Amino acid sequence: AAQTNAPWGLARISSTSPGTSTYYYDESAGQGSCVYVIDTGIEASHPEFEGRAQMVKTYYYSSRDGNGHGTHCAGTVGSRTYGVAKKTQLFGVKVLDDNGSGQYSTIIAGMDFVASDKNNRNCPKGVVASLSLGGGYSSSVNSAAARLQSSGVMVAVAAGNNNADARNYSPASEPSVCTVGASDRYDRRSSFSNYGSVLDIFGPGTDILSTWIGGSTRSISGTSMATPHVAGLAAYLMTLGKTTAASACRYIADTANKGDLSNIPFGTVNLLAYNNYQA
Ligand SMILES: [Ca+2]
Ligand SMILES: [Ca+2]
């Protein structure tokens, strides 16, 4: 399949060179896989989700997304126009309030919930969890992310937007998950993106167009935008049978575009997510 005039992030992950505008992908498009979006919620009624998204858990008064952050990330995962895996199933877990904040104890409970909730969902091709959040270092938050990964879920987390080493931020500093940095359309490291040895992969993160609340769209930037690219790619590869939840992060790094990025400090991987699609 080919999506012409696609968002630059989608075209980048289906090309070995920057500057293209077509997203090449296999028609399976992640059908049979499931992706939990642990964020501010999802506006599941948005036409771009085609009825494939639903809220399953909230830790506040409502399950509605009153911020837009979670709706934006979920659209990058699997919306029709702006998504990597255009046929996956989306589940929303609202651990952040409508201001974009949340306590660590609530974020931990959300991860434990996903580990248990997947056992009563029909996801024959596997389960992915996308965490576009984080804060200061916390061993308890790292441990919860390691538990979710150990339970059989491919966990992708944002590296952070501090332009610093991600080793002082959680859950980005947990080695067993997949920590995602951000890049721009010129194959440069995003000026805000964290770095360090704990990073596993880079994804498109600057000026990312996706869905928004009120049935609209808008373009925002952050490592919170790069993570759903990797989460969507994992569901796309797992549906194709290329990898499993336990080894998806390693397979993505093994098959990524290598050396294409600039302004990468020494000690940080120079790897860019890539789907290796050949018609
Ligand atoms: Ca290249
Ligand atoms: Ca890792």
Do 137 and 46 form a contact (C-beta atoms < 8 A)?
A: no
Q: Which amino acid is at 143?
A: S
Give dist(CA 35, CA 29) in Å, integer: 13
Do 160 and 135 form a contact (C-beta atoms < 8 A)?
A: no
CA of 63 to the centre of ligand 1 (A): 42
Give dist(CA 82, CA 109) in Å, integer: 30
Per annotation, catalytic residue among 14, 39, 98, 165 = 39
CA of 42 to the centre of ligand 1 (A): 34
Tokens of 28: 């399976």
Distance of CA 30 to the CA centre of its chain: 14
Strands 271-272 and 257-258, by their bridges, are antiparallel
Q: In the CATH scheme, what architecture does the domain 1-279 have?
A: 3-Layer(aba) Sandwich (3.40)
For 143, the 3-state DSSP assignment is helix
Give dist(CA 151, CA 174) in Å, integer: 15
Q: Is 28 a catalytic residue?
A: no
Locate tokens 């609340």: which residue? 213
Q: Between the CA of residue 44 and those of 128, 150, 174, 222, what are the distances in Å?
A: 18, 29, 30, 23
For 2, the 3-state DSSP assignment is strand
Q: Is 69 a catalytic residue?
A: yes
- 3-state class percentages of the chain: helix first, strand second, coil last, to nearest 5: 30, 25, 50
* Domain ranges across the chain: 1-279
Q: How would you label 204-236 residue by residue, b for 16+ Cβ within 10 Å and e otherwise?
A: bbbebbbbbbeeebeebbbbbbbbbbbbbbbbb
Q: Is 39 a catalytic residue?
A: yes
